[PDB]
Every structure is written in C-alpha cells, then in structure tokens.
Paper text:
BTK, a validated target for B-cell malignancies, presents a reactive cysteine (C481) in the ATP binding pocket of the kinase domain that has been co-opted for the development of potent covalent inhibitors, including approved therapeutics such as ibrutinib. As a starting point for our work, we selected an irreversible covalent degrader (referred to throughout this study as BTK-cIAP1-Covalent degrader (BCCov)), from a previously disclosed series built from an Ibrutinib-like BTK warhead fused to a known ligand of the IAP family of E3 ligases. Here, we present a study of an irreversible-covalent degrader (BCCov) of BTK as the target, and cIAP1 as the E3 ligase. We, therefore, set out to expand our understanding of target recruitment within the framework of covalent degraders targeting BTK and co-opting cIAP1.
Focusing on the ligand binding domains of both BTK (kinase domain – BTKKD) and cIAP1 (Bir3 domain–cIAP1Bir3), we performed extensive crystallization trials in the presence of stoichiometric BCCov - ultimately yielding a 3.0 Å (2.3 Å anisotropic) structure of the ternary complex in which the covalent attachment of BCCov to Cysteine 481 of BTK is unambiguously resolved. This includes a striking outward flip of F559 allowing this aromatic sidechain to pack against the cyclohexyl moiety of the cIAP1 ligand of BCCov within the context of the ternary complex, highlighting the flexibility and induced contacts in this non-native assembly. When compared to prior BTK/cIAP1 ternary complexes, this represents a fifth crystallographic snapshot, highlighting the breadth of topologies that can be achieved for even a single E3-ligase/target pair and from closely related degraders.
Residue numbers in the entry:
A (entry chain D): 261 to 351
B (entry chain B): 392 to 489, 492 to 546, 555 to 659
Write the structure that this text describes.
Amino acid sequence: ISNLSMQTHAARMRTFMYWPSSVPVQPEQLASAGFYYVGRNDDVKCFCCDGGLRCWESGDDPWVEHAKWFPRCEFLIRMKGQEFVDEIQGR
Amino acid sequence: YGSWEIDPKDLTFLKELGTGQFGVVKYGKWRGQYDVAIKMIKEGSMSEDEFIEEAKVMMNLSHEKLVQLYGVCTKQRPIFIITEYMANGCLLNYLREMRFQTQQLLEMCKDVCEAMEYLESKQFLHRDLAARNCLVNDQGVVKVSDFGLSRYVVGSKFPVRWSPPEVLMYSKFSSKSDIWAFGVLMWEIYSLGKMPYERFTNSETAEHIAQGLRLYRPHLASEKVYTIMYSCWHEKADERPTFKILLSNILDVMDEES
Ligand SMILES: [Zn+2]
C-alpha cells in the first residue's frame, strides 16, 4: 500500500472537500474506486497502487478508468475482480 | 562503442524526474561526468524480447532535433533507456508556463518538423507525436522523444485527440498518421498547451473527427499559419503533405514575418 492514511473510504472522502464543483465525476465513486484528492486541479491517487489519474470527463467511471490504466492494482482486483478488469483491458 | 549498452554500475541516480508515458524517468550521472536521463521501462506492458532485438535500429538514428539516445541496459528488469538530459522538461508544461513571441512559437514547430523530416527519410515512425513527448533543452530547443516505443505494446482513450480517422477506425499507421499528429502539435503550440478538442469527451471526439470536425484556428496562429496545420488534416490520407513540404511552408512564413 502507498498511502496507508487513505486505506479507509471515509479518509479518502475527506480529501474531496476541496474538489472543484465543475468536475463531472463524483467524489463518492472516486473514493469508492480507491482514489483520494491530492489537492491540485482534479489529480487523484489510488491509496494502494499509487496510480494517478486526472482530466476527468463526463460519463467516466472511476472503476473503469482504474482498470484502463492500472489493471495490475492489488485493490481494483480485490474489489471488482479479474473478470471485470479482463473485460476492460481486453476491449 | 560499448554495443549500445551501458554498465549500470557507472549510473548514479541523483533526482527523480517523474512518470512518463512508457515508464518512470530519473536524472543522474553516467561515468560521473555525463548528465543523463534514465527511463525505467514499465514491466508487463513490454515484451522485452521484441524490444531487445529491434532497438538497434532506433539507436542508429542521429539528428540535432532528436533526443540523443546514449544506450540501453537490457541486462535486467526493468530495461533502462539512457538518453541526454533535457533541462526545460517537456513541451506541454513548458508552453503552459511560458510569454513567447509568435516567431518563437513558429521556430518550435520548425525544430519538430526538421526532426520529423529526418525520421520520414529513414522510414521510421514516431506514432505518438504530441507536446507531452517533445522535450525542451536549457536553450529552449525542442527535440522529439518517445518514438517507436508505441509499436512494442480500453473503450476510448485520450490519444484519440491526436489520431487521424484511419487510425480511429482501422488503426492504420503511416507517415500520414504522423503528419496529422504534427498538425495537432502545431495547434497545441499556438494554443499554449491547451487540450485538443477540449469541449469534447474521448468518445465524442472520435465521432466528430470522423464526421469532418477540425480544430479551430488558435488566437496566436495567423490565417496563413493555420493553413499549414490545416494541410495536415486531410480526410483522405493520400492528399496530406510531407515533412519536407511542411518544412518549406513553415520557412516561407519565417521570411513573410521577419
Ligand atoms: Zn489502484
């Protein structure tokens, strides 16, 4: 695990206090997919794989973007399973 | 000499530079005298067997406006691509930080064109030409980087904004897929680090470039400079220009301005 202080959903949810309202991806589904707000623009990191994501568009799924960019993540696999990841990566 | 291979014992890691497209990059000294950038190539994405053999072609390229590749450390996992160090970092953040004069903006396009004209002569493909891949040295000169690595291994990803309709649809790479990627790069340069098709999503962008939607003329781009970057975006790849044609269109505007 990279940021151990963000392993709990509620810890991650607090970082989304300064999240811009303009961003069209919800802090709830971002904190659910392992992401926490880093403090600048829309930059989010996975507490587990340390993978960073940004430039969130409308109609994005944080879990799908998690598997699209960091599929070998030991948290994405424990939460959504390899059968979700393989359908996304193998598209 | 050295068989394009560097002894990793002669590499001193000084500072972290950040995560690139194809791996994390560090800064240091090769033989304690030479300033280098060591790219640790990401595990799982690369075959390593496919790269180890074909890398010899890529190393033999030598050009002023191409990031000097010093050598590779293939003897381990991850492989390390040791190259020269580019003080001003990448073009994308560099424009975003800055304000230049427009003759400085055109000059940047001219450095990238001169390097693409060279790769075009050697039948090599960049495949991933964008401001995030071009690097800027301590003298403000742009040099092309991250070439070919794309050819050694989702629903709708971000490089859709840099790709022509034949790449979005059939995934057909050629010197015309790189001519188009250069016109988009000219647009990023004149728009000062702006995102191409910023109002559209990754998926909306695909069914818009396909329909015939193009990038609007940047505020800093003159109506004749916009003609050069618009040449690059022909619906039919065959009626697109060459890096030598483009270089001559660019050098015409440098005299018709100064
Ligand atoms: Zn993760």
